[PDB]
Design an enzyme around this catalytic site. Structure first.
Site, PDB file in Angstrom:
ATOM      1  CG  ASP A  35      35.779  41.362  34.686  1.00  0.00           C
ATOM      2  OD1 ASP A  35      35.195  40.709  33.334  1.00  0.00           O
ATOM      3  OD2 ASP A  35      35.342  40.642  35.667  1.00  0.00           O
ATOM      4  CG  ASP A 219      35.246  37.866  30.743  1.00  0.00           C
ATOM      5  OD1 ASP A 219      35.514  38.959  31.542  1.00  0.00           O
ATOM      6  OD2 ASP A 219      35.517  36.755  31.444  1.00  0.00           O
TER       7      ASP A 219
HETATM    8  C1  LIG Z   1      42.431  41.666  30.331  1.00  0.00           C
HETATM    9  O1  LIG Z   1      43.497  41.724  31.391  1.00  0.00           O
HETATM   10  C2  LIG Z   1      42.842  40.932  32.424  1.00  0.00           C
HETATM   11  C3  LIG Z   1      43.692  39.746  33.078  1.00  0.00           C
HETATM   12  C4  LIG Z   1      43.198  38.958  34.255  1.00  0.00           C
HETATM   13  C5  LIG Z   1      42.884  37.404  33.643  1.00  0.00           C
HETATM   14  N1  LIG Z   1      42.786  36.451  34.867  1.00  0.00           N
HETATM   15  C6  LIG Z   1      41.678  36.131  35.446  1.00  0.00           C
HETATM   16  C7  LIG Z   1      40.366  36.162  34.904  1.00  0.00           C
HETATM   17  O2  LIG Z   1      40.009  35.782  33.458  1.00  0.00           O
HETATM   18  N2  LIG Z   1      39.150  36.660  35.511  1.00  0.00           N
HETATM   19  C8  LIG Z   1      39.086  36.925  36.983  1.00  0.00           C
HETATM   20  C9  LIG Z   1      39.338  38.553  37.347  1.00  0.00           C
HETATM   21  C10 LIG Z   1      40.336  38.413  38.558  1.00  0.00           C
HETATM   22  C11 LIG Z   1      40.018  39.471  36.307  1.00  0.00           C
HETATM   23  C12 LIG Z   1      37.739  36.470  34.788  1.00  0.00           C
HETATM   24  C13 LIG Z   1      37.205  38.008  34.464  1.00  0.00           C
HETATM   25  N3  LIG Z   1      35.812  38.067  33.889  1.00  0.00           N
HETATM   26  C14 LIG Z   1      34.899  37.172  34.621  1.00  0.00           C
HETATM   27  C15 LIG Z   1      35.373  35.747  34.917  1.00  0.00           C
HETATM   28  C16 LIG Z   1      34.455  34.918  35.662  1.00  0.00           C
HETATM   29  O3  LIG Z   1      34.610  34.825  36.832  1.00  0.00           O
HETATM   30  N4  LIG Z   1      33.306  34.113  35.040  1.00  0.00           N
HETATM   31  C17 LIG Z   1      32.856  34.307  33.564  1.00  0.00           C
HETATM   32  C18 LIG Z   1      31.512  34.827  33.469  1.00  0.00           C
HETATM   33  O4  LIG Z   1      30.528  33.913  34.321  1.00  0.00           O
HETATM   34  C19 LIG Z   1      30.917  33.594  35.549  1.00  0.00           C
HETATM   35  C20 LIG Z   1      32.525  33.395  35.894  1.00  0.00           C
HETATM   36  C21 LIG Z   1      36.988  35.573  35.253  1.00  0.00           C
HETATM   37  C22 LIG Z   1      41.742  35.668  36.387  1.00  0.00           C
HETATM   38  C23 LIG Z   1      43.282  35.555  36.511  1.00  0.00           C
HETATM   39  C24 LIG Z   1      43.560  36.365  35.713  1.00  0.00           C
HETATM   40  C25 LIG Z   1      45.242  36.443  35.691  1.00  0.00           C
HETATM   41  C26 LIG Z   1      45.965  36.228  34.255  1.00  0.00           C
HETATM   42  C27 LIG Z   1      47.147  36.594  34.340  1.00  0.00           C
HETATM   43  C28 LIG Z   1      48.231  36.766  35.396  1.00  0.00           C
HETATM   44  C29 LIG Z   1      47.110  36.887  36.746  1.00  0.00           C
HETATM   45  C30 LIG Z   1      45.916  36.666  36.786  1.00  0.00           C
END
Ligand SMILES: COCCCCn1c(C(=O)N(CC(C)C)[C@@H]2CNC[C@H](C(=O)N3CCOCC3)C2)ccc1-c1ccccc1
Ligand SMILES: *[C@@H]1O[C@H](CO)[C@@H](O)[C@H](O)[C@H]1NC(C)=O
Length: 333
Positions: A35, A219
């Site tokens: 990530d 991301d």
């Molecule tokens: C490419 O494959 C990755 C799939 C993961 C996508 N996903 C996220 C998720 O998108 N994230 C959090 C992290 C735990 C993997 C993001 C990862 N990058 C950081 C993001 C974040 O927290 N941000 C964005 C940048 O500024 C701070 C906050 C969150 C949450 C939940 C799921 C999920 C989706 C389907 C089924 C089960 C779970």
């Protein structure tokens, strides 16, 4: 040095991309999302209460079975846009693509059913900068760099479209893989060190949004392309998509007829066709089809910002260049 190294990734349903890492001696294996949108490493802990159902269904790191474990025990709370995980700091030997590193990582003891009961991965390997790491923990890539083994201070992401006798994805640590891209890399400089974020100078349908310039986070840990609520609402009104609870949808027949979406990045126009952003699970007018674009409200200082997740990386092979503080895009193949 001269070493290049790869991690083979699994593609679950174009929504989750994850590879395997080993932690401890002997190595306990975990499925992890790599990530660029965060900078911490965490896996679920054996000290996680089994009242969290997510801890019943994922692999748990057991410190008691690792002879290379080094205690720390500092509390850690990681607040992602879509959920919090909580736990404590530990140190152990992490093996990733045939590279061993001594790495501080989070042992998660609190792991909500949403969204983690829907995760095929166990934890996360943050590929971001030390600036955004909670607890000021040295990120894994910073640790790999310190060893002086990699040919270059870069890592690259390939996410496959297909998910069936084919690799779901690949991360090259130390370079890129010419077998998974074509044409020249287009390099866009970051706004600043600390975040994998670039200037975006317009979002186009068929310009409606981001005309006065906005931020785009690259991301790898996100499924979809996300914007702010108001950005997405206007995008979806323009697409004729109906808002649901967690996604936007169209009637599956209207899917192929949906206009192209363009992201003006670094002077070039990055275009996704409906085939790139619609889950065409059907062509029926009686059926609804999910778009791979949703809303995510990201607070300051990172946001408000767009996020370019798997939807974008699928089409564009992405090189992350820590040495020059820039992102390279090339057509994936
Ligand atoms: C490419 O494959 C990755 C799939 C993961 C996508 N996903 C996220 C998720 O998108 N994230 C959090 C992290 C735990 C993997 C993001 C990862 N990058 C950081 C993001 C974040 O927290 N941000 C964005 C940048 O500024 C701070 C906050 C969150 C949450 C939940 C799921 C999920 C989706 C389907 C089924 C089960 C779970
Ligand atoms: C945890 O790690 C920090 C930073 O390396 C250090 O200051 C502290 O002494 C450690 N605590 C324990 C209990 O090992």
């Amino acid at each position: 040095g001269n070493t290049t190294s790869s991690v083979i990734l699994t593609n679950y349903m174009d929504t989750q991309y994850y590879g395997e890492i080993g932690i401890g001696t002997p190595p306990q294996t975990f499925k992890v999302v790599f990530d660029t949108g965060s900078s911490n490493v965490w896996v679920p802990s054996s000290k996680c209460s089994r009242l969290y159902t997510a801890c019943v269904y994922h692999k748990l790191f057991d410190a008691s079975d690792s002879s290379s474990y080094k205690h720390n025990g500092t509390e850690l709370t990681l607040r992602y846009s879509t959920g919090t995980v909580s736990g404590f700091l530990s140190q152990d030997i992490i093996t990733v693509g045939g590279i061993t590193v001594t790495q501080m990582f989070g042992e998660v003891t609190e792991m909500p059913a949403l969204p983690f009961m829907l995760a095929e991965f166990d934890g996360v390997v943050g590929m971001g900068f030390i600036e955004q790491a909670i607890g000021r923990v040295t990120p894994i890539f910073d640790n790999i760099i310190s060893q002086g083994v990699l040919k270059e201070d870069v890592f690259s992401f390939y996410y496959n479209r297909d998910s069936s006798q084919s690799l779901g994805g690949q991360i090259v640590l130390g370079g890129s893989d010419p077998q998974h891209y074509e044409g020249n890399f287009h390099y866009i400089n970051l706004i600043k060190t600390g975040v994998w974020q670039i200037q975006m100078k317009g979002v186009s349908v068929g310009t409606l949004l981001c005309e006065d310039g906005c931020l785009a986070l690259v991301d790898t840990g996100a499924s979809y392309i996300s914007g702010s609520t108001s950005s997405i609402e206007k995008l979806m009104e323009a697409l004729g998509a109906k808002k649901r609870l967690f996604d936007y949808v169209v009637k599956c027949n209207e899917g192929p007829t949906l206009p192209d979406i363009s992201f003006h990045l670094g002077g070039k126009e990055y275009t996704l066709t409906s085939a790139d952003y619609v889950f065409q699970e059907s062509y029926s007018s009686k059926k609804l089809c999910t778009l791979a674009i949703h809303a995510m409200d990201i607070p300051p200082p990172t946001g408000p910002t767009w996020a370019l997740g798997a939807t974008f990386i699928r089409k564009f092979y992405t090189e992350f260049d820590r040495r020059n503080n820039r992102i390279g895009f090339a057509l994936a193949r």
